[PDB]
Structures are given as structure tokens and as C-alpha cells.
């Protein structure tokens, strides 16, 4: 689920007959977005053939063709040429906005804040995660409109960086929520619990958990030539492909709308309960409004992405095997991933810039 | 460069110890005492836990509080009041019985107004304490409150006089939204008086943490 | 009479000299590590080790050449606003609101720094302090008084009184025989460590005085007030020679220090920056900026190699 | 007591005699600057 990694073709019908070897000119591996695993044989003509890797003969041909160097799959070219309509400006403006915001936050924390609190360490780590995301964003913007101009190891490292940034930002949001919970409900306990060394320890553990979750995506992703153009995507082995697919679409979902949302409704609930002790209407109303804004923004910017992922994975359930419905679902996945990019690029302005002490540091750095 | 490396490692030792001491200071709570005639806060000092500045340390409910009594400083207050910038809260003790003695209540009020409306203590709160309540009852039902306040709460009873004194003390805080004053009347049991201090300190820490994270 | 000895203003006299012109100092070393607001500092004769006072209850010796910490001393009184570094480099004096002047021995075995002596009996707080010698030491108390102490004796060798307002600062002459003291009563008074009384009193201010420094020649001294002005007085002329006051600055002054040649007079203001003026021409020469909070402490090395400026923002930096 | 003119003369003379030994006024090179 990197840049929606929309494959050129996903086909759902196999062959019941044998195809000769002389009619097999090139081989292509279907991405993980397909409902079922398959391999596409490009013949002498532009017409292509599909085969399921569960066969015994398909292995023989897919090996013989690469040792040297039926039905037609529904080409997902309209998806790209509609993506080519307005993907690039959207990706570019999101990238530049998030980049300037994250550099602002990091420079502020370095100059004015000097990392005095554990919240500062968490904010710096979240900004670094967003920066890692935004470093990969334009590289995928350049792949949406044109063929992949990089190699296998390059797109693999880029996938690694992308998923590392995503998972680390998702975990650091939870870490900031837990820090706020410990500061509001257990302030006298947080005075001895919130330490910078514990913050760095939890940040390192979060980074290693994020990279450990990303490694399944890194090893199961490669770049291959589909005709003239190149594409890098996730290709799981046909032995347990669906299973791995499920695992993939489970993990993000488990970290998309289950774990962070429960952490939020557990922590911010107690925060709002304790806010009754504030006895300041102008402050209490603003705090509840900010909490509700964070909740609703996280929902509006993450729920459609996990929903569309669940749509694309479980195709037997709510059957959408029609390739036109597949094109609509892929466009929905693209727009929802871009919505998640907007969420990650506006999380700095919603977690830091809303604070008055942060705005003071910013205006001090400005002058 | 053995000497240079030794000096750098000694600087690292000193910086590590300084960071540890700073964490210790941030963990503990620093409180301030102020009063017209007696800022020693005998009500709080009477607790069993317990030369110009008097330092009193006591841990309550897994929280250490340091209190600084400033009474031996007969010099100008504005010349050294900036040193206490950054404290948790200021505990202002006012004797309720010191309302008819002479101007003393007026001096306490002007001191409270000058301290609360100071540019160096805008964010810090004020834990106001009213001492001598049992004697205040005798004084208020034996002598009228018109001596100090022209309005004197109208009814001129203990409850009304205490309420009017509290509202008048809160009237001096021009920074209503910025600064919140926690007013309390001292009790015979020191445990309730220290529990109020703990609650006020917890509220101040809540405000500070919400300003740190960004909710406030 | 005082007005009889007046010839003219100093600017009319010095209008023939060549102006220094625009001067800009760059930050060489920035010293960090104090987890509180920094108030006072002092320089050494070797121009390598300096002292700094901060509200964190810890006083650390700064190695300005390598930007490192040499000695660290925990303080039982976190409310400190004065500190002095002895020219011999063996004793460091620390005061504050505790009314106690603690002397710390820098050179001891096994790096064990302990209080050499505790000077008590001060009715008011310690506002300023400087070292006459390793054993003779002067301090300014908060009861409008100055006290000259002996280390090994522990008694008041000399007591200077006569100020109506709270004494804030003192300055020692290069000859280490006479000194000056500035108080809140808008007065700068001369005292002798041997005679033990006020020899001359200099007035001409409207607000409190909190900064003072001798000229490198020793016959003049500038005073720092809180109404954005710095007046220069002479010991022999009994005359106010010159006054610094500008329309852009209206805030107070915290520290005043002279350079090696004395041609440049530095003063830390409350406008989050320090100002370097020309000694004679009475015009501004430089604006040192870069401190987040108000510049509290200002010091110049005895040889005038560089200038240390420290603010309430836990930041003290070296300019040259 | 002396005149304010003689005092200013002594001050400016001490300044001009010591103007050479002024690291603030005279920008010293990096080889001559410990800082």
C-alpha cells in the first residue's frame, strides 16, 4: 500500500488449457492489490495471458523465460491517466506544506525549546517521521505520472522509509496521547515519570518496532518491467499470498482505527473528565473543542483509508471483482492515501502550532 | 591530548550532574510565602512534617514541596522579587483578625495587589490563606466590619464578611483568565490545610502541562 | 564650589578627537549548562576562567578558552544574585538572598570543593561583592551597607554606612585601595578600605542605581541607572563629565563594564541586548544582540581580550 | 577639586595612550585571537 502501488493489470480468470512456450515472450508479476495471485505472460502481440502460480507448468515457464534474461487482464491505464490529471500538484503542495511545517517545528525545538520536556522529544521524533514520509512523497508523485526511473534496491529503500515514517508517526501520536494522559490524570506521578532519558528510550523502542513492522513490506516489494514502463510493488509468494495480504491490511488497520482510536478515547476521556477542575469556561471550552477537532480530523483522514484497504483485500466479501469497480476502488485508495498524507503533514500544526508557548517560540525565532 | 580529553570528560561529568540536579528540581514543587505582617505561614508550618529566606521542605502524597518565607528582607521588594520567577505558586497568608488593627488590612490588600499585578508573576497562581478564623468570628460578631470596608457585606455576619473579604481579595487580580486564585480558610487540622495546598499545586501543574503540550 | 570648578561639557572638549565609528562583535563562544536564570559573573586576571551565578543552586567555573566546566559547587541557597572571582583564582565568593557570603576554595585535594568561610550577620541580601585580596573581601548588603571581611577571622574588619537607599553594586579601583558603591537612592559614594568612611558622594540620577564600574585609568567611573542613562563621574574633578541617554532605549540597565583601553563602555540593558558606547564622544558604537532574555551580567577581561555577557535566558556568551 | 577640562584631558590622554592595547577597538587576526 505504497502510493497505492496501483498495478497495470489485475485479472481474475485463469486458463483451463495449456499455452505454448513460443507464445510467451515476457513475464510480469501481479501486485498485491489483485484479488488473486497471478502472472501475466506478454506474447509477441500486445495481447496478454494470465496464469495462476499454483500450477506446476507455470513455474517451468516463469523460470525458463528469466533464465534467458486466454483472457485479457483489465488494464488499469485509465486509473493512471485520471491520476495523471491531478495527482502531481496535490502531492507537491502536500509535500511542501508538510516539509515547511516539520522544518519549522524541528528548528523551533532545536533553538528555543532545546528539548527540555519529553513532549519535546516526542514532537521532534514525530516531525522526523513526517519528514521521512515527505521525502518519499514526491518520489511517488514522480512515479504516478511516469515510469519508475529507479532500481529495485532504490524503491525497496524508499518503501522502507515510507512505511517506517508512517508507522513511527502513528506510534508517536499514541505516545503523545499517553504523555498528555499522564500529565493530566497523574501529574504528580508524571513529575517523576516524565524524564528525557525515558523519552529517548521509548522513542528508540518505537523506532525499532516501526522498522520491525516495515521489514515485512521491504522484503516483499520489488521493481519489475511491465512492457515499456517499470513499476515497483509488493508481490507475495503464491503459497500464502492472501494470508500475507490479510496480515498487511490487518496491521495498518489495527494501527489505523483500532489502537490509536482506543488510546484516544481512553486518554482524552480522562483528560476531559479532569478538565472539570479547571473551572475556566474560556479555557475548558477551547480544550474540549481542540480535543474534538483532533478526534474528528483523525477520523475524517484515516477512516476512509482503512475502509478502502479492507474493501480491496476482502473482495469475496462485498464482491467487487468487476475491473471497473476495481478502478473506482483504486482511485479511492489513491485519494485516501493522499488524505492520510494531508493528515500526517497537518499533524505538526495541530499538535504543536495550536499551543501558545509554541507560537511564542515561533515568533521569537522569526524576529 | 590527554589533558584536553580529561577536561572534556570532567565537563561531561559536571553537565550530567547538573542535568540530574535540574531533573530533581523540576520534580519537586517550589512554593512561595507572602504576608503583610507575618509571612511565616504558621498554619502550614504547624504540620508535623515541616537566614534571610526561610526554606521549608516537606513531602506529601508522593510530592515534595519547598516553601520560601521572605520576611527578613527589609529592603525594597521590587529589587529581589524577580529572583523568585518560575515558582509553582505563591501562598499569600492574610490574618482575618487583622482587619481592625492599625491600616494593616489595607497594607495587606495593597501588598496583594502589587504582588498579583506584577510582570514577573503573571503565570504563577496564588494560594490565598485566611488565618485566625475562630478569632475572626469573635471580632466580627463583637466589632463591625465597617471599620475596614465601607460596604462590610451589608449583613455584617461571619459568613457574609468572609465572602466579601474573599471577593475583595479576588478583585485585585486583574488577570482573571491568566491567573487563578485558590482561596481557603485555615482549619484546626493541618491535614486539610496541606490537602488544599496539594490540590492547588496539582491544578497549577495541570495548567502548566496543558500549556506545555498545547491544550491551553 | 562644585559649580565653580565647571568649565564646559566634555563633548565640547573632545569634539576634536577622531570617532571610533561603527564596531561589530561576533559571538566566539556561547556557554550553556545552567538550568536557571543567570544573574552575576566575574572575570579572572588570566582571562581563561570565569564564574557565573544561576538560580539552579549550582555554581560552575567556565573555561572560556575551551568552553568547559572546571569546578561545580552545589549551593544551599538557590536564590543567588551575586558572585565574585578572586584575582588569585583560589577563592570564589557567592552570596544571594540568604544573607550569607560563602567562600569556596577552588584549589583543593581530590577535587573536593567545600565552603572556606561563611560570612553572616547581614540584615539585608547580598547585592554585590568583589575581592580586595585573597583574605580581604568587600560585599554589599541589603541594609544600605557595605562590609569588608577577613577570611581567617570571620569578623567585620570594616563597615561602610551612610546610604539612604538599598545598596546594589560596588566597584573596585585597579589600585585596590579605594572603591565606589551605588545604591537605590540615586547616589554613587566613594569609600576607602583603610579610612573606613565616605570620602565623596556623587548624585545626579532620578531612579535607582544598580551598576557601576571604574575607568581603567582609575580616576573616573561610570554608573548604571534604571532610567536608560549612564553618567560618568571623576574622583578628582568632583564633576559630572558626561551622560548617556538615547530615545530608542527607555528600559533599565543591569550591568556596566569598561574595556581594556576604556574607549568603549559596555552596558547591559533590559531590551534583550547590550550597548557599547564611545567613552568620550558620547555616542553609540555597537548593539550586541543574541540574548533571549534581559542581559543580567556583563564582564570584561583584565587584558580586554573579550567580553562575556550573560542573560536570564540561561545563556552567557563571549564576544570579540 | 580640579577642572572638568583637565579631567577630560587626562581621560582622553589615557585612552589615546592605551588605544594600541585595545583588542576591542583593534580587530586582531585569528592567530592573535584565542577566542
Author numbering:
A (entry chain R): 1 to 69, 112 to 409
B (entry chain A): 6 to 55, 182 to 233, 241 to 354
C (entry chain B): 21 to 340
D (entry chain C): 27 to 61
Please quote the paper that reports this structure.
Additionally, a disulfide bridge between the receptor and chemokine [T16C (CCR5)-T15C (MIP-1α), E172C (CCR5)-F28C (RANTES)] was introduced to further facilitate structure determination (see Supplementary Note for disulfide design). Using the optimized CCR5–chemokine proteins, the cryo-EM structures of MIP-1α–CCR5–Gi1 and RANTES–CCR5–Gi1 were determined with an overall resolution of 2.9 and 3.0 Å, respectively. Additionally, in both chemokine–CCR5–Gi1 complexes the side chain of the N-terminal residue S1 forms a hydrogen bond with the receptor residue Y2516.51 and the main chain of the third residue in the chemokines makes a hydrogen bond with E2837.39. For instance, the MIP-1α residue E29 forms a salt bridge with R168 in the CCR5 ECL2, while the counterpart in RANTES, Y29, disrupts the ionic interaction with the receptor. Similarly, residue Q33 in MIP-1α makes a hydrogen bond with residue K1915.35 at the extracellular end of helix V, which repels the positively charged K33 in RANTES. This movement results in a rotamer conformational change of W2486.48, which is known as the ‘toggle switch’ of class A GPCRs39, subsequently leading to the outward rearrangement of helix VI on the intracellular side to accommodate the G protein.
The chemokine receptor CCR5 plays a vital role in immune surveillance and inflammation. CCR5 exerts its physiological functions by binding to multiple chemokines, such as macrophage inflammatory protein (MIP-1α, also known as CCL3) and RANTES (regulated on activation normal T cell expressed and secreted, also known as CCL5). Here we report three cryo-electron microscopy structures of Gi1 protein-coupled CCR5 in a ligand-free state and in complex with the chemokine MIP-1α or RANTES, as well as the crystal structure of MIP-1α-bound CCR5.
